[PDB]
C-alpha cells in the first residue's frame with residue numbers, strides 16, 4: 068500500500084486538472100502493477116482484473132468507462148515529458164523504432180513484439196526509474212527475460228554488467244567483481260544494470276553479499292586495507308569532478324553508499340520452479356524486500372502464433388488452391404477467417420507446441436522423468452522448418468531444371484537425327500525410344516509438380532519431429548508423429564502419407580557411412596544420427612552404453628575430434644585450443660556441467676566486431692566456424708537444470724520396451740522370411756534413393772549423348788543405355804503400383820511376428836527388473852542380445868523344420884526355454900519357480916486361446932490382504948479359522964461365489 072501511494076503520488080507530480088476518471092485510472096494501473104504481475108496462474112490474473120473492476124465500480128458508481136477502456140492499461144513517459152498514459156499501437160511503433168537502433172548497436176536477432184513484451188518492458192522501465200529498482204524476473208528459459216532486460220536497460224541508458232561464471236569461479240573473484248561494479252556505480256557515476264541468473268550462483272556467499280547490497284546498499288566486509296584506501300581515493304576524486312565537497316572518511320563512505328543506492332539496479336532471473344524460491348527466500352531475505360518480482364508466464368498461444376507468423380515470412384507458403392473443411396483453431400482470435408494456408412501452417416506449428424505440452428503433462432501424470440519445453444524449442448523448430456523447407460525446395464528445383472536441360476538435349480539429339488536421316492532401323496529404334504523418353508519425362512515433370520503440394524506438410528512434420536522429439540522413446544516419438552499427421556490432415560494441409568523419416572531426412576550414402584562407423588541398424592539409432600547430423604542446438608547425447616560416443620568419435624575421426632570432460636581440470640585448456648583450431652570437442656559426463664559453456668551453447672558470439680570473437684570467460688576468443696562442441700553422459704536418466712535443457716538438443720539412445728520390440732521384430736524379419744525384409748528395404752529405398760539412382764542413369768545418358776555426338780553407324784552404345792533406362796523405369800513403376808499389395812502383406816507378416824517381439828521385450832525387462840529380487844541378479848542388454856541371436860542363428864530344433872508357422876512356435880518355445888536356462892543358472896534355488904512362473908505369465912499373456920485372467924492373478928497376488936471379519940467363523944468341523952478366512956476371500960472372487 069505504501070508503494071501504491073508512492074506510485075500514485077509520482078504519477079501526479081507534474082500533471083494537473085486530472086478528472087476523477089484519470090485518477091481512478093492511475094489507481095487501477097498501480098494496483099495491477101503491484102498486485103497482478105506477481106500472480107503465476109492466468110486464473111489469478113483474471114480474478115484480479117475482475118475484482119479491481121468491481122471494487123472500482125463499487126466505490127465509484129458515478130464514473131465513465133474512462134476508468135478502464137482497453138484492458139491493456141499502459142503508462143509510458145517515453146512519448147511525453149510527463150507520465151502520461153499511452154496507447155498500445157503508438158508504444159509498439161515507438162518500441163520498433165528504438166529496436167532498429169538497438170539492433171544496429173548489437174543483438175541483430177529479431178524480436179517479434181506481442182502484447183506481453185510491451186507490458187514487460189514497461190514494468191522493467193518502471194522499476195528502473197526508481198533509484199532502488201531491483202528486479203526478480205521469474206520466468207521459463209527462452210521467454211527473453213535477459214533479452215528484454217538488456218533492451219530496456221540500454222533504452223534508459225544503463226550500462227549492463229554480467230558475471231562470467233565457471234566451475235573454478237571462487238568467492239574472492241565474486242568479491243572483486245562486486246568491488247568493480249560498485250566502483251563503476253559510485254565513482255564515475257555510471258548507472259549499472261548489473262544482472263545475474265540462477266546459473267550465475269554457485270556459492271551462497273554471493274547471496275549474503277547481495278543481501279546487504281539490496282537491503283542496505285552497502286557491503287561492509289568488502290573493502291578492506293589497500294582496496295578501501297584506493298576506493299576512497301577514487302570516490303573523493305569523483306566527488307570533486309561531480310561538484311561534491313570532500314568530507315571526512317566516514318561521511319565520504321556514506322556518500323559513496325548513497326551514490327551506489329541511486330546508481331545500481333540488480334536484476335535476478337530465476338527458474339519458475341517454486342521449490343527453489345522457497346529456500347532462495349531463506350538464503351537472502353532481501354529478495355522479497357528490495358526486489359519487485361515480475362512473473363514471466365510461458366509464451367501464450369497469442370505469442371506463439373505471432374512468432375510463427377512473423378518468422379515464417381521469408382518462406383513462400385502461399386498455395387492458391389486450399390480448402391478448409393473443419394474448424395481446428397488454436398489462436399482463436401486473430402484471423403480465424405478462411406486462411407491462405409499460411410495461417411494454417413502457423414496454426415499447425417503452435418498446435419505442435421501445445422501437443423508437446425500435453426504430452427509432457429501426460430508423461431508426468433503417468434510416470435515421471437519429464438523435461439520442460441521452453442519457447443527456445445519453438446524458435447529452434449521454426450529455424451529447422453525454414454532451413455529444411457529451403458533445402459527440400461531448392462533440391463527439387465535444381466533437379467527439375469536438370470530434367471529441363473535433359474529434355475532440351477534430347478530435342479537437340481532429335482534435330483541431329485533428322486539431319487542425319489536426310490541406318491534406317493537404328494533411326495526408328497531411337498525414334499521410338501525417344502518418344503518413350505518424352506512420355507517418361509513429362510510424367511517426371513508432372514510428378515515434380517505433384518511434390519510441390521506435399522513439400523510444406525512433409526517438411527513441417529520432419530522439422531517438428533527433429534527439433535522437438537529426440538528425448539522421448541520410440542513409442543512417444545511415434546505417438547507425437549501420428550498426432551501431428553492426423554492434425555495436419557484434419558487441417559487439410561497436403562502432406563504425403565506413409566512418410567519415411569529416415570529416408571526423407573538422409574540419403575543412402577550417409578546412412579551406409581553411419582552403418583560402417585559403428586551404428587546399429589535400429590531405426591532409433593538412424594533417427595538419432597539424423598538429429599546428430601543437422602542441428603542448431605549442440606547435441607547432448609543420452610546413452611547408457613558407449614555406442615553413441617564411439618559412433619560420433621568415428622564420424623569425426625578426420626576432423627580430429629578431441630576427447631575431454633568436465634571433470635578434467637584442463638577442460639578449459641582442452642576447449643580453448645579446440646575453439647581456436649576449429650576442431651570438434653566431445654565433452655562427456657554432463658552431470659557436473661560447467662557454466663562456462665553458457666556463451667557457447669547460447670551462440671551469443673558478437674559478430675559486430677571485425678573478427679567473430681566470443682567472450683568465453685574474461686578473455687575474448689575468435690569463434691572458428693568448424694567448432695562443433697558435443698555433450699554426452701553415461702547414465703540412463705537424470706534430472707537436468709532447465710537452463711541447460713533449453714540450449715541443447717536431447718538425443719536419447721536409451722532403450723525401452725518399444726525399442727526392444729522394434730529391434731526384435733526387425734531381427735526376426737531379417738532371419739525369418741527374408742523376402743519381406745528385402746521388399747521393405749526396397750520400399751524404404753523407393754523414397755528418393757531409387758529416384759537418385761535414376762537421376763544418375765539420366766546424367767550418364769546425358770554424358771553419353773555428347774560423348775557419341777549422335778553416332779548412327781554404331782547406335783547400340785546409346786541403345787543399351789536407353790533400354791536400361793526403360794527397364795529401370797518399368798521396374799520403378801512396378802514397385803510403385805505394388806505399394807498397395809505391399810504394406811498389405813508386409814503388415815500381415817509384421818503382426819504375425821508381433822507376439823515374439825513383445826515376449827522378447829517383456830522377458831528382457833523382467834530380467835532387468837530382477838535386480839530387485841537379489842543384488843546378484845544383474846543382466847546386461849548384451850546378454851539378452853546373445854540369447855536372442857543364439858535362439859535365432861544357433862537353434863538345433865530349427866535345422867530341419869521349414870514351415871514358417873511351425874518355425875515361429877518352435878522359435879518361441881526355444882526362446883522361453885533358453886532364456887530360463889541362461890538366467891536361472893545364476894539364481895538361487897528358491898527363485899527358479901518365481902522366474903519360471905513369471906515367464907509362464909508372459910507366455911499366457913502372449914497366447915490368444917484363453918483370456919488373460921488378470922483378476923485371478925490380482926487375487927492370487929494381493930487380494931487375500933482384503934480386510935473383513937464377517938463370516939470368519941468355521942462352519943464345518945474339518946476347517947480352521949485361517950482356512951475359513953481363505954474361503955471367504957476366495958468367495959469374494961467372482962469365479963468362486965458358491966464356495
Ligand SMILES: Nc1ncnc2c1ncn2[C@@H]1O[C@H](COP(=O)(O)OP(=O)(O)O)[C@@H](O)[C@H]1O
Nearest residue numbers: 176177178179184207208209210211212213214
Ligand atoms: N519477443 C520475442 N520474440 C522473439 N524472440 C524472442 C523474444 N523475446 C526473446 N526472444 C528470443 O529469446 C532468446 C533469448 O532468450 P533468453 O534471454 O536467454 O531467455 P531467458 O532470460 O528467459 O532465459 C533469443 O533467441 C531471443 O531472440
